[PDB]
Amino acid sequence: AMDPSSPNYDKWEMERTDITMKHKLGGGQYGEVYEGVWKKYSLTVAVKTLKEDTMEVEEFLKEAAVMKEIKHPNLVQLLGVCTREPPFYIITEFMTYGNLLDYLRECNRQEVSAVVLLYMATQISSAMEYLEKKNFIHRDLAARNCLVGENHLVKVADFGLSRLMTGDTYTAHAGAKFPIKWTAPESLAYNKFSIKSDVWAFGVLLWEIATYGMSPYPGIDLSQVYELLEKDYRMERPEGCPEKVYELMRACWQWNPSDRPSFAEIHQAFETMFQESSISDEVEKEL
Numbered sequence: 292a293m294d295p296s297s298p299n300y301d302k303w304e305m306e307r308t309d310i311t312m313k314h315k316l317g318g319g320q321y322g323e324v325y326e327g328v329w330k331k332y333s334l335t336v337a338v339k340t341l342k343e344d345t346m347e348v349e350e351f352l353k354e355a356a357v358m359k360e361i362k363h364p365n366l367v368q369l370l371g372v373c374t375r376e377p378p379f380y381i382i383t384e385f386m387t388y389g390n391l392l393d394y395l396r397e398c399n400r401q402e403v404s405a406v407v408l409l410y411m412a413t414q415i416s417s418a419m420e421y422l423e424k425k426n427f428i429h430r431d432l433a434a435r436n437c438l439v440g441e442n443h444l445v446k447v448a449d450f451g452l453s454r455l456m457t458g459d460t461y462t463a464h465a466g467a468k469f470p471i472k473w474t475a476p477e478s479l480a481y482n483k484f485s486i487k488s489d490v491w492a493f494g495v496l497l498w499e500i501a502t503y504g505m506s507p508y509p510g511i512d513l514s515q516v517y518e519l520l521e522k523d524y525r526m527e528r529p530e531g532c533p534e535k536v537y538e539l540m541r542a543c544w545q546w547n548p549s550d551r552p553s554f555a556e557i558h559q560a561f562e563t564m565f566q567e568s569s570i571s572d573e574v575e576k577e578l
């Protein structure tokens with residue numbers, strides 16, 4: 292596939308010996324993803340590989356194919372693949388600060404101020420606006436699936452955490468493992484996923500951002516979440532959150548999917564949200 296004249300030529304295919312494989316990334320909270328070094332550039336990269344004899348070879352190849360079709364500053368950047376023969380690799384850039392959820396929980400709040408949180412939320416909506424217009428659905432948007440780079444740059448990723456994750460984030464539901472607290476009602480009850488269920492998840496992600504990474508619906512048992520949501524319960528405006536930001540969360544959590552804003556509308560909302568007063572002024576007024 293590396294031969295220019297070949298009808299099977301793929302500019303993404305690269306020589307895997309160009310990469311030095313290091314240890315598994317983030318301990319193992321990403322599964323078979325390893326830190327690697329692209330020798331020629333002395334560049335640290337992230338390398339996703341396939342688990343020992345699994346039946347997700349087609350899903351792996353499908354993911355590689357989809358990544359070749361997307362290019363956006365806020366989506367993890369594909370650097371190359373090694374899929375001509377085993378072992379299959381998907382290589383992407385390495386993001387210095389790791390996942391957004393841990394970053395929010397461990398950051399210097401003086402640096403990562405309300406302005407920066409808004410910037411992070413806006414960048415995420417930009418990536419989703421892109422996927423939206425290209426007719427893609429994310430299906431598992433949450434802070435744990437976003438990465439943070441230099442200067443608070445945020446990129447939306449998809450680590451296929453469903454089964455890798457430990458703890459209560461993902462629980463048994465509809466024959467699969469669902470991160471219930473980020474799942475839209477129609478997804479929970481009718482297994483219907485769409486860009487609108489991503490919007491509902493984005494609203495939960497916005498709440499994660501606004502609380503520096505608190506876990507949603509704290510103290511509520513998952514077995515009562517649907518009934519509560521059906522009777523219009525929603526997490527209250529969190530401490531210090533600007534009213535306008537909370538209104539956007541509420542819009543994302545409309546019961547009817549069709550009533551939720553598009554990501555294009557969400558991104559625009561962010562860009563013009565604080566034209567009469569700054570978010571800093573609102574976070575003071577609120578407190």
Ligand SMILES: Cc1ccc(NC(=O)c2ccc(CN3CCN(C)CC3)cc2)cc1Nc1nccc(-c2cccnc2)n1
Pocket residue numbers: 316317321324337338339354357358366367381382383384385386387388389390427428429430438447448449450
């Ligand atoms: C090495 C790799 C291989 C594949 C991917 N893939 C994606 O991140 C991704 C994002 C969006 C889509 C779009 N897709 C559309 C269809 N729907 C259903 C799912 C989403 C697909 C793949 C990322 C990576 N990068 C990655 N993976 C795990 C951890 C890290 C990582 C960790 C710490 C610091 N820097 C990087 N980096």
Ligand SMILES: [Cl-]
Pocket residue numbers: 426427428429
């Ligand atoms: Cl899709």
